[PDB]
Homo-oligomer: A and B are copies of this chain.
Amino acid sequence: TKGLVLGIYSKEKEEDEPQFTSAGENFNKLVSGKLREILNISGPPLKAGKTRTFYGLHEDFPSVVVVGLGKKTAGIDEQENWHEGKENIRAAVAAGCRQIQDLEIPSVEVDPCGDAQAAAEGAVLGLYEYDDLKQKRKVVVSAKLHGSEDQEAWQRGVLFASGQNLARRLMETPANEMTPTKFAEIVEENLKSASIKTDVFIRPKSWIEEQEMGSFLSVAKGSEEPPVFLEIHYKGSPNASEPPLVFVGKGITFDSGGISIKAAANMDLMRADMGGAATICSAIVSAAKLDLPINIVGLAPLCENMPSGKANKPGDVVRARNGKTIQVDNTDAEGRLILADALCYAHTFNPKVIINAATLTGAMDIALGSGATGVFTNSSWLWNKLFEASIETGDRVWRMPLFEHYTRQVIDCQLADVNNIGKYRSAGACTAAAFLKEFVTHPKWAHLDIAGVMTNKDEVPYLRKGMAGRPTRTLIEFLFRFSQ
């Protein structure tokens, strides 16, 4: 019928037994001490992230899963740059919820564990799974807050997690289904359901050609799938003339590499080469659901990178919207090409800040893996705001260098103004970022390379195996704090 997830902390030295949360101690009382008695009989105490299931304790809750929360007073961890307490909660709740799902129970009530937003994030992120195309599926579990106190915190958590889950769905979906047009239509419907203060323009190829986006066009032409330039507006500020914050996302729905073709091994993961677009767009949908009082513009060039009789050829020279020429030495370095045009266009909105996200380089994954998103920025103020936000969400960011040293390696070019791959193979993520800087004149610009946090195997406990949707929540948190 209905399941229940309860938390218990690790025992502190001067305590006689590990302490339950408020909901845990109360439940124990409701069942006349039966919960504590059975936990004692079952064996060793529960450590952070571990779970244990007890049956028949109450007629309304035939299955009760107790989860280990770790140390009660865990706050900000200086070594890890995150709030440890929140991370323990998200992981423990996800584990509890999955045990309830394995038991095939359709609904679960969750202990707020001293921080309802984090508990909600663990349940919602933890239970997610993309199974639309399978006949064999797990039971759909409805998770709700146990109790009626602090409902707003719980709901804030569901909102944040739902935002990241949308990014995951968009990324996980096979490319033949998640085409440039389909992605745009899904985002449009999600933003419009979130708020009536929105405008969406799924700009077609003719518009792209009118905007002189020759760099973006050179990439798209190799494929038979039509390209689109997604532009979204969220008018949340009281003053309509208030300059917007602009977000830009790389939307390659599928990257085969083009003529500079990729190796077969694990190339299926390239259906998520639109993760940049998925994360910034989901962040705008959430900000819109939250009705944040700020104006926001989202831009996402979308297309496929395929080999054919009309594809980009190594050595070809293309002209960006701003007139700069680019020598396309490697057709698989296509993200920086489409972003050159999107970033130029971003300046037309005379924005307050410009933030782009992209699953850009294999070098970023080699650099930091899934530990943190790499952030390249010309503004320490901006770096600090993103960093602070990440400490709260736990979806970490780490700063990478924007030095002229790297710019030199991309402007040293045989045929044009700038080369799309550096002279050397060293510092791939840094030279890619340097390339993007040639298309930015704004004082507050940040580039997020999310190639390393594209997927999850088991690094983040509360995310099942698959596309991660990172760092959506950090983006939402940043916008939230910015609006205040």
Residues of A bordering B, CB below 8 Å: 78-80, 363, 365-372, 378, 380, 398, 400-406, 408, 424-431, 452, 457, 459
Q: Decide if A425 touches B371 in the complex (CB within 8 Å).
A: no
Q: How far is the CA of A400 from the CA of B374 in the complex (A)?
A: 11
Q: How far is the CA of A343 from the CA of B368 in the complex (A)?
A: 24
> Does B365 lie within 8 Å of A459, measured CB to CB?
no
Q: Which of A368, A398, A431 has the most CB of B within 10 A?
A: A368
Question: In whole angstroms, what is the CA distance A400 to B366 when docked?
Answer: 13
Which residue of chain B lies nearest to A374 when distances are taken between CB atoms in the complex?
B367
8 Å CB contact of A371 from B371, B372, B398, B403? B403
Known: A426-B452, A427-B452. A403 touches B80 (CB 8 A): yes
Which residue of chain B lies nearest to A365 when distances are taken between CB atoms in the complex? B426
28 A–B pairs (Cβ distance < 8 Å), ordered by A: A79-B378, A79-B402, A79-B403, A79-B404, A363-B366, A363-B367, A365-B427, A366-B366, A366-B425, A366-B427, A367-B367, A367-B427, A367-B429, A368-B400, A368-B401, A368-B427, A368-B430, A369-B424, A370-B426, A371-B406, A371-B427, A371-B430, A372-B401, A372-B403, A398-B400, A398-B401, A408-B459, A427-B452
- The distance in angstroms between the C-alpha atoms of A44 and B155, with both chains bound, is 67
How distant is A349 from chain B, measured CB to nearest CB, in Å?
A: 24
Interchain nearest-CB distance for A448 vs B (Å): 16
Residue of B nearest to A378 (CB): B79
A366 with B426: CB separation less than 8 A: yes
Closest Cβ of chain B to A431, distance in Å, is 8
Is A405 a contact partner of B459 (Cβ separation < 8 A)? yes
Give A333 to B127 CA distance when docked, in angstroms.
39
Closest to A78 in B: B380
Closest residue to A406 on the B side, CB-wise?
B371
A424 to B425, CA, bound (A): 21
Known: A365-B427, A371-B403. 16 other contacts (CB 8 A): A79-B378, A79-B404, A80-B404, A363-B367, A366-B367, A366-B426, A366-B427, A368-B401, A368-B427, A369-B406, A369-B424, A369-B430, A371-B406, A372-B401, A405-B459, A424-B457
A457 to B422 Cα, complex, angstroms: 14
Closest chain B CB from A97 CB (angstroms): 22
Shortest Cβ distance from residue A368 to the other chain B in the assembled complex, whole angstroms: 5
* A403-B79 Cα distance, complex, nearest whole Å: 7
Chain B residues, CB < 8 A from A429 = 367
- A408 — which chain B residues lie within 8 A by C-beta? 459
Distance between Cα atoms of A286 and B131 in the complex (Å): 64
Q: Tell me, rounded to whole Å, the shortest Cβ–Cβ distance linking A442 to chain B.
A: 14
A404 to B429 alpha-carbon distance, docked (Å): 24
| In the bound complex, CA of A236 to CA of B368 (Å) | 40
Residues of B within 8 A of A430 (CB): 368-369, 371
Q: How far is the CA of A431 from the CA of B400 in the complex (A)?
A: 18
